[PDB]
Amino acid sequence: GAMNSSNYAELFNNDIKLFVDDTNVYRVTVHKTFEGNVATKAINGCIFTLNPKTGHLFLKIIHTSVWAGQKRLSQLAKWKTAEEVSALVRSLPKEEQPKQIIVTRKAMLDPLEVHMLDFPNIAIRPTELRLPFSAAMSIDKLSDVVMKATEPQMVLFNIYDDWLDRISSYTAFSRLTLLLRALKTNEESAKMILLSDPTITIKSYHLWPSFTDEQWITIESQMRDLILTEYGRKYNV
Amino acid sequence: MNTVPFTSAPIEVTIGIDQYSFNVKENQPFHGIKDIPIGHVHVIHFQHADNSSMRYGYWFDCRMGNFYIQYDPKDGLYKMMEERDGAKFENIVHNFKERQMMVSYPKIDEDDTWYNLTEFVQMDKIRKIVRKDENQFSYVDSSMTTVQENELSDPAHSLNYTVINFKSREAIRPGHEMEDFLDKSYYLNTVMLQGIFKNSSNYFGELQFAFLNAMFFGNYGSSLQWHAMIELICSSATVPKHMLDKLDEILYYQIKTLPEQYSDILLNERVWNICLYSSFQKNSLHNTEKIMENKYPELL
Ligand SMILES: CS(=O)(=O)N(Cc1cccs1)C1CC1
Numbered sequence: 001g002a003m004n005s006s007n008y009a010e011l012f013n014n015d016i017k018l019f020v021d022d023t024n025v026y027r028v029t030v031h032k033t034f035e036g037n038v039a040t041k042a043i044n045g046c047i048f049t050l051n052p053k054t055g056h057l058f059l060k061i062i063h064t065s066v067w068a069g070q071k072r073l074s075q076l077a078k079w080k081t082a083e084e085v086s087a088l089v090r091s092l093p094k095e096e097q098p099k100q101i102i103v104t105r106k107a108m109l110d111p112l113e114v115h116m117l118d119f120p121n122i123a124i125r126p127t128e129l130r131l132p133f134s135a136a137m138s139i140d141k142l143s144d145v146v147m148k149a150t151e152p153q154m155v156l157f158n159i160y161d162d163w164l165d166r167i168s169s170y171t172a173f174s175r176l177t178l179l180l181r182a183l184k185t186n187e188e189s190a191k192m193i194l195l196s197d198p199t200i201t202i203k204s205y206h207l208w209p210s211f212t213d214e215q216w217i218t219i220e221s222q223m224r225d226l227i228l229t230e231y232g233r234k235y236n237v
Numbered sequence: 238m239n240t241v242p243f244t245s246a247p248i249e250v251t252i253g254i255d256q257y258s259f260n261v262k263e264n265q266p267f268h269g270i271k272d273i274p275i276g277h278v279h280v281i282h283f284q285h286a287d288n289s290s291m292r293y294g295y296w297f298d299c300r301m302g303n304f305y306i307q308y309d310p311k312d313g314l315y316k317m318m319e320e321r322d323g324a325k326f327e328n329i330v331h332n333f334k335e336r337q338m339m340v341s342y343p344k345i346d347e348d349d350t351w352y353n354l355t356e357f358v359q360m361d362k363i364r365k366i367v368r369k370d371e372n373q374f375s376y377v378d379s380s381m382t383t384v385q386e387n388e389l390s391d392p393a394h395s396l397n398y399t400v401i402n403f404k405s406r407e408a409i410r411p412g413h414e415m416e417d418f419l420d421k422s423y424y425l426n427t428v429m430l431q432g433i434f435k436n437s438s439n440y441f442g443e444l445q446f447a448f449l450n451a452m453f454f455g456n457y458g459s460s461l462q463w464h465a466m467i468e469l470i471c472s473s474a475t476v477p478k479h480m481l482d483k484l485d486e487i488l489y490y491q492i493k494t495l496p497e498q499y500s501d502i503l504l505n506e507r508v509w510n511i512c513l514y515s516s517f518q519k520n521s522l523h524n525t526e527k528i529m530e531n532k533y534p535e536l537l
Binding site: 111113117 | 404405406409414415418
């Protein structure tokens, strides 16, 4: 059934599972036309498919050409997501295929279930968690590879960098969701926190800065302050 | 005009014959139903006064044999049986008619209700849904489950309706996932009509039989089947025009006949709202939409 606060440690057991987030698949800019009407222009998007135990991120870039000549694009986007996730699963060796796929939005359940009929033993699950994976395009290297794509492309990243050498996958996921929640509530401030100190760099093969353990505690504190504030600045408290 | 005699009525029971019904008291001198129209299937059905649990009954066609009812005190129900001795039967029936111990099938001449509800229903197809090959008539009751229900447990006592499942490999062509899920025409026309049912008459017959089992016995799996067969048509963008017109007539008479007080349990809100207002066929069921809106506007 649904994934929620009660069954949170299930994410870090030894049954392979993937989160799928479709919120950045179909992306547009809304603009005025010369006649004063409104139109959309699509920009490149991505499927965010994440193994929360290992940090393995399968980033399928959705090039704007996939929408050419198509109607009802927000509906098509869900089915295209399910088509690409199903293709990913089929591409993996049997022993790497997931036992469960957790979709971050309930509207992905039927598209994914239909595309995975060949895999009756893979459970398709919703979640009651409000996960911040939409903010993945606030990670500069992810945004960069999506916007530069000239064709459909899959890019492999570890979203935890090397953190698992020092912390557990529960702690890594909590850090990730904190960073992404911060980036989603106030991107400019979050990014200031992460880069304010020029002596801490991002390794070429990493997504986030090379913080020491002590510096991650300070960073994480600064992100929680941000989220509470914005929650005040928002609701005035 | 044919007759179904009763040996006796030892327990108090409400007896239905098609859409009609009458109460019989314990040991009342009741010896059956005469003047049953030839040319239609019929159902004779029972609800005991002491146990309103288990409505049950028998589908039959008087052209296929001479049938009668006899109470069995061991199994505790009224049983249909076939009398093979045609002269013994005619003699029994004539004696009971002479003594006026039979109710008359009370059809109003203007009234096409039963024809309209059973237009495509054939005994030979009933006997494939309800498997009991040694009898010419078919027993159904409130509790019998369907084959599809048994997959999600006695197979001999099951309703073998055609399995319809919108999220199944049968319904969804590899590579046409979105197309086939959002427009079920290939599943309707190729898989079900051309492949399984062979023609729309057999499809309508099973749809009508499922409705009648839902209405007369409260059979839940039959209600599921009826709604599934409606939704498969309404969810198809490409349906032969004669089928849509006929579906509108079929459903109109079903909704007309449904007891007002059972609409809460026999009608699925989601299916009907989808079929009448969201589906491809939202504008193709004028008669059905008009009676639904005037009779059950709450559901919608
Ligand atoms: C950087 S890593 O070591 O974790 N890794 C493994 C991955 C497989 C799928 C997504 S990442 C990249 C080389 C691929």
